[PDB]
Design a protein around this ligand. Structure first.
Ligand SMILES: *[C@@H]1O[C@H](CO)[C@@H](O[C@@H]2O[C@H](CO)[C@@H](O[C@@H]3O[C@H](CO[C@H]4O[C@H](CO)[C@@H](O)[C@H](O)[C@@H]4O)[C@@H](O)[C@H](O[C@H]4O[C@H](CO)[C@@H](O)[C@H](O)[C@@H]4O)[C@@H]3O)[C@H](O)[C@H]2NC(C)=O)[C@H](O)[C@H]1NC(C)=O
Ligand SMILES: CC(C)(C)CC(C)(C)c1ccc(OCCOCCOCCOCCOCCOCCOCCOCCOCCOCCO)cc1
Ligand SMILES: *[C@@H]1O[C@H](CO)[C@@H](O[C@@H]2O[C@H](CO)[C@@H](O)[C@H](O)[C@H]2NC(C)=O)[C@H](O)[C@H]1NC(C)=O
Ligand SMILES: *[C@@H]1O[C@H](CO)[C@@H](O[C@@H]2O[C@H](CO)[C@@H](O)[C@H](O)[C@H]2NC(C)=O)[C@H](O)[C@H]1NC(C)=O
Ligand SMILES: *[C@@H]1O[C@H](CO)[C@@H](O[C@@H]2O[C@H](CO)[C@@H](O)[C@H](O)[C@H]2NC(C)=O)[C@H](O)[C@H]1NC(C)=O
Ligand SMILES: *[C@@H]1O[C@H](CO)[C@@H](O)[C@H](O)[C@H]1NC(C)=O
Lengths: 352, 342
């Protein structure tokens, strides 16, 4: 197989340092000090201006065979777990089609644009022992999700690069809903806590209490956050978890905010989503026992583009839970417009 | 944003080599480094106010608190360094009381009383257990880090008296992280490392001291569905309630050599010894040292149903084996065994 060549790997005899820890120097801006050593270094990659990591199959040829096998067994298509996976399919389809074509296989890979959240599917690709394979796109009768594969691939090893690293995907030996743990980084230091990977950045901090402070989701996925990489996962009420478990929300008490419950009806279908606790520009939020109950997350702008100024909440805490998306700024479920006149507002239709 | 301004102002910024990711990367985030194996000399405790602390003590002394037990060596060394300053203050406020701090050899044990912010004439810190000043009348875990220093004083840590009552460890000095095939539970004296080989399991631990506080759940990984019998480092000895704190074939080392000072746990053979699986072997017992009091070597060891490599302790007085690992020869040569039972 000529699409892959390795370099140095882990098992190489390193006399200088621990090969499976991160080794370097960093400035601790709190204490204002420079420290070198070995350990675990967690970086923010969700908010990077370009992609450091890129998926590629370990063997394109092998992957083409996995697909034609799946095609024979009734698997009409596939749904990606993440934007990065989607970009791999988008980037490798012409290569796959060539493999299939030159081997006289009546099958072509079709990958459609994915705008919303990356949803789950029941089927799985497996290793070896209509004439199209559709990746993502809208939900159709021609290729329903229930016949599509999802979360069938995981990272085997990484590829060196100068301004970007390759991640090579292999076929999973098992069936899980769990996110690939190889790309997960979780850490807590100086009472600041991070649950992260290549698309989620979830930050909780101890102010007067431990609570969620900020979250950035480059996409909204449907895999499961592993317990191995989860902080504070004892005595959990899934109702209190701000980011829903079914949306790769960490089953962690860090994933909470007093006054708030599970945002099952947040704007998850908006693409990139950023959660934090501040006021939407030009709006206000006041406590009122005479306020509406939890409902779909509402955007602070109308379909026309008019601004809803006055907002209320029954029993939440301030500052309000705020979403920021491409289409504007939204408020958490427990926060409702104060005026009952619906001006044809924009609300989430997700319910997850 | 607000919380994004805070992160840049309070996070770690630098570069590191990741052989796992096969990359060299710079950036901002959170860095957990190894400090137990060198840095206990560079970070140092200071009380926020000696003066305020002297008042805190004389109050507690009046309320029947005869003395104190430190949570950690770092705390112990603070007392040792600040006693002359406190005693001077006490003298100057006409208070018939002096602080006495004794050497601490064993594990740092717990105590029920607490100092608060708002008939001997001595306040005893640590030392052996006495009837003159019993543990049950001493305070413990009354302090926490208020804040850190800066630039030149970046390695200074200023302590305040706890506003609340817990058994939990000071969380401000805790670093817990997992990335690639590595998961770390650490602070200024514990380094607890688990690795993903075929499965996630404990691989190595270094304890510069053995303390008796409780590892916070907020800084605990994989703390769901815990069987405490399976936790290698005992919960009562600041062991993390984590499934990372496990090793297939082994149960809680309640009778390990915790009273020896520095302890290093890992899974390798003691030099000159061997370990074999045998159903005709002894059941779990106190951890045994591979050398006798005389200085003779035990070579042959057995275990009933554990996994190899064996659980190994390393202390100043030598190398020991896990509770489930017993000498194969039944002739007792007067062995050196742990007497802790925790
Ligand atoms: C880290 O965590 C700390 C504490 O957990 C936070 O500190 C608090 O921040 C809030 C937000 O500003 C403060 O609340 C404000 O208090 C002002 C004064 O308090 C009134 O009420 C008290 C009763 O306790 C009286 O004693 C006092 O005399 C005042 O009458 C108010 O003026 C503020 O009101 C504003 O917002 C309300 C919201 O409805 C409006 O109705 C008002 O018109 C006005 O616009 C607000 O209530 C609180 O005082 C702070 N406490 C402390 C101890 O500092 C930090 O904010 C937090 N930091 C981060 C980054 O998260
Ligand atoms: O150290 C200072 C870092 O300065 C910050 C600049 O950005 C750092 C991000 O990393 C990119 C570095 O760019 C150069 C690539 O470095 C990798 C080592 O280069 C050796 C490659 O030689 C050929 C490989 O075969
Ligand atoms: C792999 O596991 C998943 C989850 O355990 C299975 O998903 C279920 O599949 C059935 C129909 O196939 C659906 O009705 C359920 O709703 C699914 N549960 C979910 C999505 O949580 C899946 O069937 C398994 N597939 C294989 C090939 O093992
Ligand atoms: C009051 O406290 C002092 C200091 O702790 C006690 O003096 C020591 O007591 C121990 C107890 O066995 C002796 O071993 C030491 O030799 C004593 N001196 C020193 C310098 O440590 C004293 O006994 C206490 N008096 C009481 C309880 O009545
Ligand atoms: C990771 O686990 C594997 C077993 O799953 C270890 O492999 C064994 O290594 C020992 C000595 O290194 C050999 O005697 C065995 O034959 C190996 N077994 C197999 C199945 O290969 C491996 O050593 C572990 N890695 C580390 C770093 O401890
Ligand atoms: C400290 O708190 C614990 C928590 O239950 C309690 O049992 C104990 O009595 C308290 N001690 C003091 C001195 O307040």
């Amino acid at each position: 197989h000529h699409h892959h060549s390795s370099g140095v790997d882990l098992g190489t005899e390193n006399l200088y340092f621990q090969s499976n820890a991160d080794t370097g120097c960093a400035i601790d801006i709190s204490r204002q000090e420079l420290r070198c050593g070995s350990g675990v270094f967690i970086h923010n990659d969700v908010e990077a201006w370009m992609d450091r990591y890129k998926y590629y199959p370990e063997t394109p040829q092998g992957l083409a065979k996995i697909i034609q096998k799946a095609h024979k067994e009734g698997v009409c298509g596939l749904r990606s777990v993440s934007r990065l996976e989607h970009q791999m399919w988008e980037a490798v389809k012409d290569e796959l089609n060539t493999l299939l074509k030159e081997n006289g296989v009546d099958l072509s890979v079709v990958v459609e644009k994915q705008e919303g959240m990356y949803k789950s599917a029941p089927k799985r690709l497996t290793a070896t022992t209509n004439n199209t394979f559709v990746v993502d796109g809208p939900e159709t009768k021609e290729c329903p999700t229930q016949n599509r594969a999802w979360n069938s691939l995981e990272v085997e090893d990484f590829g060196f690069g100068l301004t970007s690293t390759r991640m090579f995907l292999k076929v999973r030996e098992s069936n899980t809903t769990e996110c690939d743990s190889k790309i997960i980084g979780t850490a807590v230091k100086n009472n600041l806590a991070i649950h992260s990977d290549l698309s989620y950045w979830i930050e909780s901090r101890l102010n007067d209490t431990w609570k969620l402070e900020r979250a950035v989701l480059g996409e909204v996925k449907s895999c499961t956050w592993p317990e191995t990489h989860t902080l504070w996962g004892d005595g959990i009420l899934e109702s209190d978890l701000i980011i829903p478990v079914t949306l790769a929300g960490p089953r962690s008490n860090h994933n909470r905010r007093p006054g708030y419950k599970t945002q099952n009806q947040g704007p998850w279908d908006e693409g990139r989503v950023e959660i934090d606790f501040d006021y939407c520009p030009g709006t206000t939020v006041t406590l009122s026992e005479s306020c509406g109950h939890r409902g779909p997350a509402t955007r602070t702008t109308t379909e026309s583009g008019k601004l809803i100024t006055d907002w209320c909440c029954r029993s939440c805490t301030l500052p309000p839970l705020r979403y920021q998306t491409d289409s504007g700024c939204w408020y958490g479920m427990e926060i409702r417009p104060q005026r009952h006149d619906e001006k044809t507002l924009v609300q989430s239709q997700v319910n997850a």
